[model samples]
Target: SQAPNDPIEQYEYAQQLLASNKAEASPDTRYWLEQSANQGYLPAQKQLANDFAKGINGEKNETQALYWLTSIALNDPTDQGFLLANFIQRNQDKVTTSQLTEALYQMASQHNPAAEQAYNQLLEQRFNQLR
Candidate 1:
Protein backbone atom coordinates (compact mmCIF):
# COMPACT_ATOMS: atom_id res chain seq x y z
CA SER A 1 0.00 0.00 0.00
CA GLN A 2 2.44 2.62 -1.15
CA ALA A 3 1.20 6.17 -1.06
CA PRO A 4 1.47 7.53 -4.54
CA ASN A 5 3.18 10.88 -4.93
CA ASP A 6 1.30 11.97 -8.03
CA PRO A 7 -2.22 11.78 -9.45
CA ILE A 8 -1.49 9.14 -12.08
CA GLU A 9 0.26 6.93 -9.57
CA GLN A 10 -2.63 7.26 -7.17
CA TYR A 11 -5.10 6.49 -9.93
CA GLU A 12 -3.22 3.35 -10.98
CA TYR A 13 -2.80 2.16 -7.41
CA ALA A 14 -6.50 2.67 -6.76
CA GLN A 15 -7.37 0.68 -9.86
CA GLN A 16 -5.17 -2.19 -8.76
CA LEU A 17 -6.82 -2.07 -5.37
CA LEU A 18 -10.18 -2.46 -7.06
CA ALA A 19 -9.09 -5.71 -8.72
CA SER A 20 -7.66 -7.06 -5.46
CA ASN A 21 -10.24 -6.10 -2.82
CA LYS A 22 -12.94 -3.74 -3.92
CA ALA A 23 -14.95 -4.00 -0.72
CA GLU A 24 -12.03 -3.49 1.64
CA ALA A 25 -10.19 -0.96 -0.47
CA SER A 26 -13.06 1.45 -0.78
CA PRO A 27 -11.84 4.11 1.58
CA ASP A 28 -8.24 3.90 0.56
CA THR A 29 -9.24 3.83 -3.06
CA ARG A 30 -11.54 6.76 -2.55
CA TYR A 31 -8.78 8.77 -0.88
CA TRP A 32 -6.35 8.13 -3.69
CA LEU A 33 -9.05 8.76 -6.28
CA GLU A 34 -9.99 12.10 -4.77
CA GLN A 35 -6.36 13.10 -4.61
CA SER A 36 -5.83 12.13 -8.22
CA ALA A 37 -8.94 13.98 -9.34
CA ASN A 38 -8.04 17.09 -7.39
CA GLN A 39 -4.81 17.10 -9.34
CA GLY A 40 -6.84 17.02 -12.58
CA TYR A 41 -6.11 13.50 -13.68
CA LEU A 42 -8.93 12.71 -16.04
CA PRO A 43 -8.77 8.93 -15.81
CA ALA A 44 -8.81 8.99 -12.03
CA GLN A 45 -11.79 11.29 -12.06
CA LYS A 46 -13.56 8.91 -14.38
CA GLN A 47 -12.85 5.90 -12.15
CA LEU A 48 -13.94 7.72 -9.01
CA ALA A 49 -17.27 8.55 -10.60
CA ASN A 50 -17.67 4.93 -11.63
CA ASP A 51 -16.99 3.76 -8.10
CA PHE A 52 -19.57 6.14 -6.72
CA ALA A 53 -22.15 5.24 -9.35
CA LYS A 54 -21.64 1.54 -8.77
CA GLY A 55 -21.68 1.96 -4.97
CA ILE A 56 -18.51 -0.08 -4.69
CA ASN A 57 -16.97 2.23 -2.17
CA GLY A 58 -19.84 3.74 -0.21
CA GLU A 59 -23.26 5.16 -0.72
CA LYS A 60 -23.65 6.45 -4.24
CA ASN A 61 -22.87 10.15 -4.40
CA GLU A 62 -23.84 11.02 -7.90
CA THR A 63 -23.74 14.78 -7.42
CA GLN A 64 -20.22 14.75 -6.06
CA ALA A 65 -19.12 12.01 -8.43
CA LEU A 66 -20.57 13.68 -11.47
CA TYR A 67 -19.05 16.99 -10.43
CA TRP A 68 -15.59 15.49 -10.63
CA LEU A 69 -16.39 13.38 -13.66
CA THR A 70 -17.79 16.37 -15.50
CA SER A 71 -14.59 18.27 -14.93
CA ILE A 72 -12.63 15.39 -16.39
CA ALA A 73 -14.95 15.15 -19.35
CA LEU A 74 -14.13 18.75 -20.20
CA ASN A 75 -10.76 17.43 -21.27
CA ASP A 76 -11.69 13.91 -22.34
CA PRO A 77 -15.26 13.93 -23.45
CA THR A 78 -15.78 10.74 -25.47
CA ASP A 79 -15.44 7.93 -22.97
CA GLN A 80 -16.54 10.10 -20.07
CA GLY A 81 -19.85 10.88 -21.75
CA PHE A 82 -20.49 7.23 -22.40
CA LEU A 83 -19.52 6.31 -18.86
CA LEU A 84 -21.57 9.12 -17.32
CA ALA A 85 -24.60 8.42 -19.46
CA ASN A 86 -24.44 4.86 -18.24
CA PHE A 87 -24.23 6.07 -14.68
CA ILE A 88 -27.29 8.24 -15.19
CA GLN A 89 -29.12 5.26 -16.60
CA ARG A 90 -28.17 3.05 -13.67
CA ASN A 91 -28.96 5.55 -10.95
CA GLN A 92 -31.88 7.29 -12.46
CA ASP A 93 -32.82 8.61 -9.07
CA LYS A 94 -29.51 10.30 -8.36
CA VAL A 95 -29.43 13.20 -10.81
CA THR A 96 -31.96 15.24 -12.67
CA THR A 97 -32.21 15.55 -16.43
CA SER A 98 -31.01 19.12 -16.15
CA GLN A 99 -27.84 17.98 -14.47
CA LEU A 100 -27.28 15.58 -17.31
CA THR A 101 -27.70 18.37 -19.84
CA GLU A 102 -25.36 20.63 -17.92
CA ALA A 103 -22.69 17.97 -17.62
CA LEU A 104 -22.87 17.11 -21.29
CA TYR A 105 -22.87 20.72 -22.37
CA GLN A 106 -19.96 21.67 -20.16
CA MET A 107 -17.80 18.94 -21.59
CA ALA A 108 -19.01 19.45 -25.10
CA SER A 109 -18.05 23.11 -24.99
CA GLN A 110 -14.54 22.42 -23.75
CA HIS A 111 -13.66 19.48 -25.99
CA ASN A 112 -10.43 19.80 -27.89
CA PRO A 113 -10.44 19.88 -31.65
CA ALA A 114 -9.61 16.22 -31.98
CA ALA A 115 -12.19 15.20 -29.45
CA GLU A 116 -14.75 17.50 -30.97
CA GLN A 117 -14.15 15.99 -34.37
CA ALA A 118 -14.23 12.52 -32.89
CA TYR A 119 -17.55 13.25 -31.22
CA ASN A 120 -19.04 14.41 -34.48
CA GLN A 121 -17.69 11.35 -36.24
CA LEU A 122 -19.05 9.11 -33.54
CA LEU A 123 -22.49 10.63 -33.93
CA GLU A 124 -22.32 10.16 -37.67
CA GLN A 125 -21.13 6.60 -37.24
CA ARG A 126 -23.93 5.93 -34.81
CA PHE A 127 -26.42 7.02 -37.42
CA ASN A 128 -24.77 4.77 -39.96
CA GLN A 129 -24.62 1.90 -37.49
CA LEU A 130 -28.37 1.99 -37.08
CA ARG A 131 -28.85 1.47 -40.79
Candidate 2:
Protein backbone atom coordinates (compact mmCIF):
# COMPACT_ATOMS: atom_id res chain seq x y z
CA SER A 1 0.00 0.00 0.00
CA GLN A 2 1.14 3.52 -0.74
CA ALA A 3 2.17 5.42 2.39
CA PRO A 4 -0.59 7.63 3.68
CA ASN A 5 -0.09 11.19 4.85
CA ASP A 6 -2.80 11.06 7.48
CA PRO A 7 -1.41 10.48 10.95
CA ILE A 8 -4.07 7.95 11.99
CA GLU A 9 -3.58 5.99 8.84
CA GLN A 10 0.10 6.02 9.41
CA TYR A 11 -0.40 4.66 12.89
CA GLU A 12 -2.75 1.92 11.71
CA TYR A 13 -0.50 0.93 8.88
CA ALA A 14 2.40 0.85 11.25
CA GLN A 15 0.54 -1.38 13.67
CA GLN A 16 -0.40 -3.77 10.91
CA LEU A 17 3.13 -3.90 9.64
CA LEU A 18 4.54 -4.55 13.08
CA ALA A 19 1.99 -7.24 13.83
CA SER A 20 2.59 -8.99 10.55
CA ASN A 21 6.35 -8.56 10.78
CA LYS A 22 6.36 -8.38 6.99
CA ALA A 23 7.80 -4.90 6.62
CA GLU A 24 11.33 -6.10 5.97
CA ALA A 25 11.40 -3.88 2.92
CA SER A 26 9.61 -1.01 4.67
CA PRO A 27 10.40 1.34 7.50
CA ASP A 28 9.98 -0.16 10.95
CA THR A 29 7.16 0.50 13.37
CA ARG A 30 9.02 3.21 15.15
CA TYR A 31 9.22 5.25 11.97
CA TRP A 32 5.49 5.16 11.42
CA LEU A 33 4.75 5.79 15.09
CA GLU A 34 7.15 8.69 15.10
CA GLN A 35 5.59 10.05 11.97
CA SER A 36 2.28 10.30 13.78
CA ALA A 37 3.81 11.35 17.06
CA ASN A 38 5.73 14.11 15.33
CA GLN A 39 2.40 15.33 14.02
CA GLY A 40 1.21 15.76 17.66
CA TYR A 41 -1.01 12.71 17.59
CA LEU A 42 -1.85 11.77 21.19
CA PRO A 43 -2.12 8.00 20.71
CA ALA A 44 1.15 7.79 18.87
CA GLN A 45 2.85 9.97 21.45
CA LYS A 46 1.64 7.75 24.29
CA GLN A 47 2.63 4.59 22.45
CA LEU A 48 6.05 5.97 21.72
CA ALA A 49 6.57 6.78 25.36
CA ASN A 50 5.45 3.32 26.38
CA ASP A 51 7.59 1.64 23.78
CA PHE A 52 10.66 3.57 24.82
CA ALA A 53 10.05 2.98 28.49
CA LYS A 54 9.48 -0.75 28.05
CA GLY A 55 12.06 -1.36 25.36
CA ILE A 56 9.41 -2.87 23.17
CA ASN A 57 11.13 -2.45 19.82
CA GLY A 58 14.10 -0.41 20.91
CA GLU A 59 16.47 0.04 23.79
CA LYS A 60 15.01 1.16 27.06
CA ASN A 61 15.75 4.85 27.42
CA GLU A 62 14.17 6.43 30.43
CA THR A 63 15.28 9.86 29.32
CA GLN A 64 13.50 9.56 26.00
CA ALA A 65 10.49 7.95 27.63
CA LEU A 66 10.19 10.75 30.13
CA TYR A 67 10.73 13.36 27.49
CA TRP A 68 7.82 12.09 25.42
CA LEU A 69 5.62 11.57 28.46
CA THR A 70 6.32 15.03 29.78
CA SER A 71 5.78 16.54 26.38
CA ILE A 72 2.28 15.12 26.34
CA ALA A 73 1.61 16.04 29.94
CA LEU A 74 2.72 19.60 29.44
CA ASN A 75 0.47 19.98 26.46
CA ASP A 76 -2.65 18.17 27.68
CA PRO A 77 -2.64 17.94 31.45
CA THR A 78 -6.09 16.68 32.15
CA ASP A 79 -6.27 12.91 31.53
CA GLN A 80 -3.10 12.04 29.67
CA GLY A 81 -1.01 14.31 31.86
CA PHE A 82 -1.96 12.54 35.07
CA LEU A 83 -1.60 9.17 33.40
CA LEU A 84 1.82 10.02 32.12
CA ALA A 85 2.71 11.56 35.46
CA ASN A 86 2.13 8.22 37.14
CA PHE A 87 4.52 6.60 34.71
CA ILE A 88 7.05 9.37 35.26
CA GLN A 89 6.76 9.03 39.00
CA ARG A 90 7.26 5.29 38.77
CA ASN A 91 10.52 5.86 36.94
CA GLN A 92 11.48 9.05 38.71
CA ASP A 93 14.54 7.50 40.27
CA LYS A 94 16.09 7.00 36.85
CA VAL A 95 16.04 10.70 36.02
CA THR A 96 18.32 13.50 37.20
CA THR A 97 17.28 16.16 39.70
CA SER A 98 17.06 18.71 36.90
CA GLN A 99 14.77 16.42 34.96
CA LEU A 100 12.57 16.03 37.97
CA THR A 101 12.56 19.77 38.46
CA GLU A 102 11.45 20.39 34.91
CA ALA A 103 8.79 17.68 35.01
CA LEU A 104 7.52 18.86 38.37
CA TYR A 105 7.18 22.37 37.07
CA GLN A 106 5.01 21.14 34.22
CA MET A 107 3.04 18.89 36.54
CA ALA A 108 2.53 21.73 38.98
CA SER A 109 1.30 23.93 36.20
CA GLN A 110 -1.34 21.29 35.55
CA HIS A 111 -2.62 21.61 39.13
CA ASN A 112 -1.02 18.49 40.50
CA PRO A 113 -0.78 19.30 44.21
CA ALA A 114 1.88 16.69 44.87
CA ALA A 115 4.01 17.96 42.06
CA GLU A 116 3.42 21.52 43.22
CA GLN A 117 4.58 20.69 46.72
CA ALA A 118 7.60 18.86 45.42
CA TYR A 119 8.51 21.77 43.14
CA ASN A 120 8.03 24.20 46.01
CA GLN A 121 10.38 22.17 48.15
CA LEU A 122 12.97 22.24 45.44
CA LEU A 123 12.55 25.99 45.13
CA GLU A 124 12.93 26.41 48.85
CA GLN A 125 16.10 24.40 48.82
CA ARG A 126 17.52 26.37 45.92
CA PHE A 127 16.60 29.63 47.61
CA ASN A 128 18.45 28.57 50.72
CA GLN A 129 21.50 27.71 48.67
CA LEU A 130 21.78 31.35 47.65
CA ARG A 131 21.90 32.50 51.24
Candidate 3:
Protein backbone atom coordinates (compact mmCIF):
# COMPACT_ATOMS: atom_id res chain seq x y z
CA SER A 1 0.00 0.00 0.00
CA GLN A 2 1.08 3.59 -0.49
CA ALA A 3 2.81 4.79 2.62
CA PRO A 4 1.11 7.48 4.62
CA ASN A 5 2.45 10.96 3.82
CA ASP A 6 4.67 9.78 1.02
CA PRO A 7 3.81 12.85 -1.00
CA ILE A 8 7.36 14.12 -1.06
CA GLU A 9 8.38 10.83 -2.64
CA GLN A 10 5.43 11.05 -4.96
CA TYR A 11 6.38 14.53 -6.08
CA GLU A 12 9.94 13.55 -6.81
CA TYR A 13 8.84 10.30 -8.44
CA ALA A 14 6.43 12.19 -10.64
CA GLN A 15 9.19 14.59 -11.62
CA GLN A 16 11.44 11.74 -12.68
CA LEU A 17 8.62 10.08 -14.62
CA LEU A 18 7.95 13.28 -16.53
CA ALA A 19 11.62 13.68 -17.31
CA SER A 20 13.05 15.28 -20.44
CA ASN A 21 12.56 18.83 -21.64
CA LYS A 22 9.41 17.78 -23.44
CA ALA A 23 7.19 17.73 -20.35
CA GLU A 24 6.30 20.01 -17.46
CA ALA A 25 5.48 19.39 -13.83
CA SER A 26 2.01 17.93 -13.44
CA PRO A 27 -0.91 18.61 -11.10
CA ASP A 28 0.58 15.89 -8.96
CA THR A 29 2.52 18.68 -7.29
CA ARG A 30 -0.60 19.74 -5.48
CA TYR A 31 -1.56 16.14 -4.84
CA TRP A 32 1.71 15.34 -3.14
CA LEU A 33 1.67 18.64 -1.26
CA GLU A 34 -1.78 17.88 0.09
CA GLN A 35 -0.64 14.44 1.17
CA SER A 36 2.43 15.75 2.94
CA ALA A 37 0.41 18.46 4.61
CA ASN A 38 -2.08 15.89 5.88
CA GLN A 39 0.88 13.95 7.25
CA GLY A 40 1.87 16.85 9.52
CA TYR A 41 4.53 18.40 7.35
CA LEU A 42 3.98 21.93 8.61
CA PRO A 43 5.65 23.75 5.74
CA ALA A 44 3.63 21.93 3.13
CA GLN A 45 0.52 22.33 5.26
CA LYS A 46 1.01 26.08 5.46
CA GLN A 47 1.86 26.40 1.79
CA LEU A 48 -1.19 24.47 0.65
CA ALA A 49 -3.41 26.33 3.06
CA ASN A 50 -2.17 29.67 1.80
CA ASP A 51 -2.43 28.60 -1.82
CA PHE A 52 -6.00 27.48 -1.39
CA ALA A 53 -6.87 30.63 0.51
CA LYS A 54 -5.36 32.70 -2.28
CA GLY A 55 -6.92 30.55 -5.07
CA ILE A 56 -3.56 29.88 -6.61
CA ASN A 57 -2.37 26.77 -8.55
CA GLY A 58 -5.78 25.07 -8.44
CA GLU A 59 -9.42 25.63 -7.83
CA LYS A 60 -10.28 27.27 -4.57
CA ASN A 61 -11.31 24.92 -1.79
CA GLU A 62 -12.03 26.83 1.37
CA THR A 63 -13.54 23.87 3.17
CA GLN A 64 -10.58 21.58 2.57
CA ALA A 65 -8.18 24.39 3.29
CA LEU A 66 -9.90 25.24 6.54
CA TYR A 67 -9.99 21.59 7.52
CA TRP A 68 -6.24 21.31 7.13
CA LEU A 69 -5.40 24.69 8.66
CA THR A 70 -7.66 24.06 11.60
CA SER A 71 -6.25 20.59 12.09
CA ILE A 72 -2.80 22.08 12.28
CA ALA A 73 -3.98 24.77 14.65
CA LEU A 74 -5.65 22.24 16.92
CA ASN A 75 -2.66 19.93 16.82
CA ASP A 76 -0.33 22.75 17.75
CA PRO A 77 -2.44 25.12 19.73
CA THR A 78 0.55 26.87 21.20
CA ASP A 79 2.58 26.95 18.02
CA GLN A 80 4.45 30.24 17.80
CA GLY A 81 4.83 30.20 14.03
CA PHE A 82 1.21 30.31 12.96
CA LEU A 83 -2.12 31.91 13.81
CA LEU A 84 -3.05 28.81 15.73
CA ALA A 85 -4.15 30.65 18.84
CA ASN A 86 -6.44 32.92 16.88
CA PHE A 87 -8.03 29.97 15.15
CA ILE A 88 -8.67 28.33 18.47
CA GLN A 89 -10.17 31.49 19.84
CA ARG A 90 -12.48 31.99 16.90
CA ASN A 91 -13.47 28.37 16.50
CA GLN A 92 -13.87 27.55 20.14
CA ASP A 93 -17.41 26.35 19.59
CA LYS A 94 -16.38 23.85 16.94
CA VAL A 95 -14.85 21.49 19.48
CA THR A 96 -15.34 20.78 23.12
CA THR A 97 -12.64 20.31 25.75
CA SER A 98 -13.43 16.59 25.81
CA GLN A 99 -12.85 16.34 22.08
CA LEU A 100 -9.56 18.16 22.42
CA THR A 101 -8.52 15.71 25.12
CA GLU A 102 -9.37 12.70 22.97
CA ALA A 103 -7.65 14.17 19.95
CA LEU A 104 -4.56 14.93 22.01
CA TYR A 105 -4.53 11.35 23.22
CA GLN A 106 -4.64 10.13 19.65
CA MET A 107 -1.80 12.44 18.72
CA ALA A 108 0.22 11.18 21.66
CA SER A 109 -0.36 7.63 20.47
CA GLN A 110 0.94 8.51 17.01
CA HIS A 111 4.32 9.28 18.57
CA ASN A 112 4.80 12.35 16.39
CA PRO A 113 8.03 13.72 17.76
CA ALA A 114 7.06 17.36 17.59
CA ALA A 115 3.62 16.76 19.03
CA GLU A 116 4.93 14.45 21.71
CA GLN A 117 7.66 16.80 22.78
CA ALA A 118 5.37 19.81 22.73
CA TYR A 119 2.88 18.19 25.02
CA ASN A 120 5.56 16.89 27.34
CA GLN A 121 7.16 20.31 27.56
CA LEU A 122 3.83 21.94 28.19
CA LEU A 123 3.08 19.64 31.13
CA GLU A 124 6.54 20.17 32.56
CA GLN A 125 6.22 23.91 32.18
CA ARG A 126 2.83 23.88 33.86
CA PHE A 127 4.21 22.05 36.85
CA ASN A 128 7.16 24.36 37.07
CA GLN A 129 4.89 27.40 36.80
CA LEU A 130 3.30 26.48 40.12
CA ARG A 131 6.45 27.48 41.97
Candidate 4:
Protein backbone atom coordinates (compact mmCIF):
# COMPACT_ATOMS: atom_id res chain seq x y z
CA SER A 1 0.00 0.00 0.00
CA GLN A 2 1.23 3.51 -0.69
CA ALA A 3 -0.34 5.06 2.40
CA PRO A 4 -3.57 5.85 4.15
CA ASN A 5 -5.56 9.03 4.28
CA ASP A 6 -3.40 10.39 7.07
CA PRO A 7 -0.50 12.60 6.04
CA ILE A 8 1.60 11.56 9.04
CA GLU A 9 1.29 7.97 8.03
CA GLN A 10 2.06 9.05 4.54
CA TYR A 11 5.43 10.42 5.57
CA GLU A 12 6.23 7.21 7.35
CA TYR A 13 5.42 5.29 4.22
CA ALA A 14 7.71 7.57 2.26
CA GLN A 15 10.47 6.87 4.74
CA GLN A 16 9.88 3.19 4.25
CA LEU A 17 10.29 3.61 0.55
CA LEU A 18 13.49 5.51 1.13
CA ALA A 19 14.97 2.53 2.95
CA SER A 20 14.46 0.33 -0.09
CA ASN A 21 17.94 0.66 -1.58
CA LYS A 22 18.62 4.06 0.00
CA ALA A 23 16.18 5.53 -2.46
CA GLU A 24 18.42 8.56 -2.37
CA ALA A 25 17.27 9.66 -5.76
CA SER A 26 13.90 8.00 -5.86
CA PRO A 27 10.91 9.53 -7.52
CA ASP A 28 8.59 7.36 -5.46
CA THR A 29 10.01 8.90 -2.34
CA ARG A 30 9.55 12.40 -3.66
CA TYR A 31 5.98 11.61 -4.72
CA TRP A 32 4.97 10.49 -1.28
CA LEU A 33 6.68 13.46 0.31
CA GLU A 34 4.72 15.75 -1.94
CA GLN A 35 1.55 13.92 -1.00
CA SER A 36 2.13 14.56 2.69
CA ALA A 37 3.44 18.11 2.34
CA ASN A 38 0.50 19.06 0.18
CA GLN A 39 -1.75 18.23 3.10
CA GLY A 40 0.01 20.78 5.32
CA TYR A 41 1.94 18.27 7.35
CA LEU A 42 4.90 20.08 8.86
CA PRO A 43 7.32 17.18 9.18
CA ALA A 44 6.56 16.24 5.65
CA GLN A 45 7.00 19.86 4.70
CA LYS A 46 10.44 19.86 6.29
CA GLN A 47 11.38 16.57 4.67
CA LEU A 48 10.15 17.62 1.28
CA ALA A 49 12.00 20.88 1.63
CA ASN A 50 15.09 18.90 2.46
CA ASP A 51 14.39 16.70 -0.51
CA PHE A 52 14.74 19.70 -2.77
CA ALA A 53 17.44 21.54 -0.88
CA LYS A 54 19.72 18.54 -0.46
CA GLY A 55 19.25 17.32 -4.02
CA ILE A 56 18.03 13.98 -2.80
CA ASN A 57 15.93 13.92 -5.92
CA GLY A 58 19.20 13.70 -7.90
CA GLU A 59 19.36 17.37 -8.96
CA LYS A 60 19.40 20.50 -6.88
CA ASN A 61 16.26 22.43 -7.63
CA GLU A 62 17.01 25.63 -5.79
CA THR A 63 13.82 27.28 -6.97
CA GLN A 64 11.72 24.49 -5.52
CA ALA A 65 13.99 24.44 -2.52
CA LEU A 66 13.21 28.07 -1.92
CA TYR A 67 9.54 27.48 -2.49
CA TRP A 68 9.26 24.79 0.17
CA LEU A 69 11.55 26.59 2.56
CA THR A 70 9.26 29.57 2.36
CA SER A 71 6.39 27.18 2.94
CA ILE A 72 8.00 26.02 6.18
CA ALA A 73 8.75 29.59 7.25
CA LEU A 74 5.17 30.53 6.55
CA ASN A 75 3.44 28.28 9.09
CA ASP A 76 6.14 26.56 11.11
CA PRO A 77 5.40 26.74 14.84
CA THR A 78 9.07 26.66 15.75
CA ASP A 79 12.31 28.59 15.42
CA GLN A 80 12.99 26.61 12.24
CA GLY A 81 10.83 29.18 10.48
CA PHE A 82 13.51 31.80 11.04
CA LEU A 83 16.19 29.22 10.43
CA LEU A 84 14.65 28.33 7.10
CA ALA A 85 14.80 31.94 6.01
CA ASN A 86 18.38 32.04 7.17
CA PHE A 87 19.17 29.12 4.90
CA ILE A 88 17.73 31.02 1.95
CA GLN A 89 20.05 33.90 2.67
CA ARG A 90 23.01 31.56 2.84
CA ASN A 91 22.41 30.68 -0.81
CA GLN A 92 21.28 34.07 -2.03
CA ASP A 93 22.53 33.51 -5.55
CA LYS A 94 20.94 30.08 -5.92
CA VAL A 95 17.72 31.81 -6.94
CA THR A 96 17.06 34.96 -8.93
CA THR A 97 16.08 38.42 -7.75
CA SER A 98 12.71 38.09 -9.40
CA GLN A 99 11.99 34.87 -7.54
CA LEU A 100 13.39 36.16 -4.29
CA THR A 101 11.48 39.41 -4.51
CA GLU A 102 8.34 37.47 -5.41
CA ALA A 103 8.64 35.30 -2.35
CA LEU A 104 9.38 38.38 -0.21
CA TYR A 105 6.16 40.10 -1.18
CA GLN A 106 4.20 36.89 -1.01
CA MET A 107 5.34 36.43 2.57
CA ALA A 108 4.80 40.05 3.53
CA SER A 109 1.45 40.28 1.80
CA GLN A 110 0.30 37.40 3.92
CA HIS A 111 1.95 39.07 6.93
CA ASN A 112 4.59 36.43 7.62
CA PRO A 113 6.56 37.56 10.66
CA ALA A 114 9.87 36.10 9.54
CA ALA A 115 11.28 36.44 6.00
CA GLU A 116 11.07 40.24 6.01
CA GLN A 117 14.34 40.89 7.82
CA ALA A 118 16.37 38.19 6.08
CA TYR A 119 14.88 38.55 2.63
CA ASN A 120 14.83 42.33 2.72
CA GLN A 121 18.41 42.49 3.88
CA LEU A 122 19.51 40.22 1.04
CA LEU A 123 17.67 42.41 -1.41
CA GLU A 124 19.04 45.53 0.20
CA GLN A 125 22.53 44.20 -0.35
CA ARG A 126 21.91 43.03 -3.90
CA PHE A 127 19.32 45.56 -5.06
CA ASN A 128 21.78 47.96 -6.66
CA GLN A 129 23.59 45.15 -8.40
CA LEU A 130 20.45 43.72 -9.95
CA ARG A 131 19.09 47.05 -11.12
Best by TM-score: 4
Worst lDDT window (10 residues) for model 2? 21-30
Q: Candidate 3 or 4, higher TM-score?
A: 4
The global C-alpha lDDT for each of the candidates, from Candidate 1 onward, is 0.69, 0.72, 0.56, 0.73
C-alpha lDDT of residue 16 in model 3: 47
lDDT of 3: 0.56
TM-score of each: 0.59, 0.63, 0.43, 0.68
**What would the TM-score be for candidate 2 when compared with the true structure?**
0.63
Runs of candidate 1 with Cα error greater than 4 angstroms are: 19-25, 77-82, 89-93, 97-131
Encode model 1's per-residue lDDT on 6-110: one tens digit a residue.
888888888777677745647778878889987888877777777776666767765566766667655685664665566667778767875554445435645
Winner of 1 and 2 under TM-score: 2
Runs of candidate 3 exceeding 4 Å displacement: 1-26, 77-131
How far off is residue 23 in model 3, in Å? 12
| Candidate 3 local lDDT, 24-115, one digit each (tens) | 43345467666776667666666676566555546765444555566567566565426544544665776455434444543454557777
Q: What is the C-alpha lDDT profile of model 4 across 3-42, one tens digit per residue?
A: 5678888888888888886646777778888898878888
Which residue pairs in candidate 1 have backbone atoms (N, alpha carbon, C) closer than 3 angstroms, thus clashing?
Answer: none
In candidate 2, what are the lDDT values of residues 1-131, reduced to their tens digit?
67878999988877887787663433467789888887878888888888878887666766567667877875665765686668757766676767655655744555677777776776678689998
